[PDB]
């Protein structure tokens with residue numbers, strides 16, 4: 001019941017590799033994440049339990065090495081379901097977005113922000129269920145019911161919210177909302193809107209000026225685009241929140257059997 005074969009390397013991570021491990025008796029599969037910040041990742045993982053969040057099973061100290069034992073997601077990355085310049089069918093996009101909201105609602109409800117939401121970190125199981133992955137940059141933004149503001153910049157530039165480049169301190173939750181928006185834009189367009197949301201960025205100025213007759217917006221369609229108008233608001237205090245994304249017309253539009 002103990003004893004696991006490493007059966008292939010799933011990918012190269014930035015830190016180690018990730019290995020598929022199968023159980024010699026039960027044939028159960030797990031991903032094994034090898035690290036030669038990591039203590040906090042393990043600590044946060046122990047906190048987490050939800051259907052659209054990669055399951056943490058355990059961890060091995062083994063000398064110097066840290067072995068992380070996580071849900072195997074045989075669907076790979078949502079990134080690989082996005083066709084360059086096309087995106088994916090809108091009903092597929094909408095389902096993925098529902099599940100991503102479920103995962104993000106769950107984290108925010110336990111005071112956790114992930115801070116690096118992007119399709120490379122949205123993994124898919126055998127049934128195309130979406131699992132949020134890699135708490136490597138995640139942190140606690142609410143504890144004993146009291147919010148702490150963030151002031152450390154991290155994430156990935158094309159998905160980062162504007163306030164994170166402009167302000168010394170900023171709320172955690174609107175940043176994760178913004179990045180879900182870029183993830184939506186991608187799924188529906190096959191294309192990232194800007195390299196960063198800086199006023200030194202023409203594509204960002206064009207969006208603030210409302211020129212939706214350009215790409216990527218023009219590929220999109222007025223119901224999902226209207227929702228994107230409420231997510232990608234420069235002022236995070238004015239940005240739509242999750243409870244209200246849930247009231248959105250497109251979000252609630254029937255599309256998929």
Ligand SMILES: O=C(O)CNc1ncnc2oc(-c3ccccc3)c(-c3ccccc3)c12
Pocket residue numbers: 010011012013018031033070071072073074075076077123133134
């Ligand atoms: O990369 C992470 O940090 C965790 N990675 C994973 N965790 C849990 N299950 C997984 O299934 C994969 C995977 C699945 C099918 C094909 C290829 C890879 C991957 C995968 C993906 C890219 C890089 C590294 C691994 C994966």
